[PDB]
């Protein structure tokens, strides 16, 4: 094809919501990839802001979407944040356990479907951060976020070339310096740190 095809999937973090410019972490990733080669780099961003893990699995069932997954030389995605923060974190442990169980089951089926459509392309599964790390309930939110990130990477470890990229430590110090006005989504600087971390994991040869 003579072209580097990047397919982006998932929720608002992959759409770039909260970034002053429209770049998001994808744009800063492409900026770094263009230091390595003059080969054209094309991005197909299929992210939807309010997407959950069950919607992403259903989205990956569309024939046109599957045709673009099979052409991908590289897959980057963020999913599960909407599974966890559906309405402010739910203070019910029974609802939280069920939401995590559905999310892990959907995530495993998402990874399997992506690998059936594309056995070669590296999948970068980007983890979650704690935006409410400056509130009184920050301790409970850090524990739940880190618990979900662990289960994410455990699911990714069951498939070849699926890299769980963490972002938790990128927002550990002075979190509001890297957050949007909603204190939930990242800002321009927060997405830049995510995109530069993902790009440094990509080496074209």
UniProtKB/TrEMBL annotation:
<protein>
    <submittedName>
        <fullName>GDSL family lipase</fullName>
    </submittedName>
</protein>
